[model samples]
Target: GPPGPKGPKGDPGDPGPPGARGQAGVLGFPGPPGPKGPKGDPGDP
Candidate 1:
């Protein structure tokens, strides 16, 4: 143990989790529709 010399002791990194999680259930239903008809229901024009 006479001489010990270090110019550097550097940079240590740790754990990272860029986690995104999703849990979903049951989604349903949409539109039901009608229309206009019979332009002339004329009797004895």
Candidate 2:
């Protein structure tokens, strides 16, 4: 009969999979931002 101070944090375990998907290639210019730079060899723009 001594457990009444831990029951207010059980509603945040189902919201972590819809905030990551916006970067495939297109942000490196001169050598800075990277995720997989070094592009351009098929058409050459």
Candidate 3:
């Protein structure tokens, strides 16, 4: 068979505009408080 036909060339795309800067992220929440310790016995007055 004869040589295959040439493939079609792709069209050039237009240039895109520059994008805006992104905003800063928010701070995370504080951690939970630790468990309380047991009370000690009363001492002499």
Off by over 4 Å in 3: 1-17
TM-score per candidate, chains pooled: 0.24, 0.16, 0.33
Better of 1 and 3 by TM-score: 3
lDDT of 3 by residue, 1-45 (tens): 999999999889988988988898898999999999889989989
Candidate 2 regions exceeding 4 Å error are 1-12, 27-45
- Say which prediction, candidate 2 or candidate 3, comes out ahead on lDDT: 3
Tell me which residue pairs clash in candidate 2: none
Candidate 1, TM-score vs. the true structure?
Answer: 0.24
Tell me, by lDDT, which candidate is best: 3
True lDDT of residue 16, candidate 3: 92
lDDT of 1: 0.75
For candidate 1, the per-residue lDDT at 39 reads: 94
Candidate 1: which stretches are off by over 4 Å? 25-45
Clashing pairs in 3: none
